Amino acid sequence: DRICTNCCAGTKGCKYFSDDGTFVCEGESDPRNPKACTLNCDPRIAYGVCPRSEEKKNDRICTNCCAGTKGCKYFSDDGTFVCEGESDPRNPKACPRNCDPRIAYGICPLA
Numbered sequence: 133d134r135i136c137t138n139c140c141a142g143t144k145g146c147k148y149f150s151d152d153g154t155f156v157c158e159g160e161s162d163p164r165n166p167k168a169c170t171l172n173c174d175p176r177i178a179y180g181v182c183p184r185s186e187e188k189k190n191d192r193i194c195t196n197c198c199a200g201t202k203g204c205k206y207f208s209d210d211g212t213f214v215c216e217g218e219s220d221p222r223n224p225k226a227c228p229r230n231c232d233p234r235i236a237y238g239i240c241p242l243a
Contacts, residue, residue, distance in 0.1 A: 137177040140169035146180030195235045198227035204238030213239075 142148050142159030149155045156177055161167035197206040200217015207213040217238055218225065 134173070135175050135177060136173035137180075138169060138172045138174045139177075141167050141172055142180060146182035148177050148180040150176045151178035152176075191231060193233050193235060194231035195238055196227070196229040196232035197235065198225065198229040198232075199223075200235075200238050201240075204240035206232070206235050206238045208234050209236035210234070 137148065139148055139157035139160055141161045142157070144159040144162035144164070147155060147158045156174075159180060161169065195206055195217070197215035197217060199219045200206045202217060202220050202223075204217055205213055206215055206217050214232075214235060
């Protein structure tokens with residue numbers, strides 16, 4: 133597509149940078165506020181690197197009594213068992229329990 137980006141009607145959060153291997157500016161227009169630049173388009177830009185450095189380490193405890201696995205006893209960190217993961221082979225179901233933080237693991241029967 134056309135590289136019609138601009139430092140004015142950008143997206144405050146991403147540091148607009150140029151393909152030449154050099155930075156430019158940051159979005160002057162936040163996806164929050166309105167804007168009326170009307171100039172637009174700047175081939176200088178390539179994209180805009182939005183800083184985060186914390187995207188990872190969040191899913192971690194994505195275990196749950198609902199969408200877990202039918203075979204393990206999804207148990208909670210509180211030192212108490214919750215229930216078995218009710219996620220059957222190709223199970224059409226998804227509770228608000230998606231990645232239950234309150235859980236800890238899923239203790240399956242050690243045969």
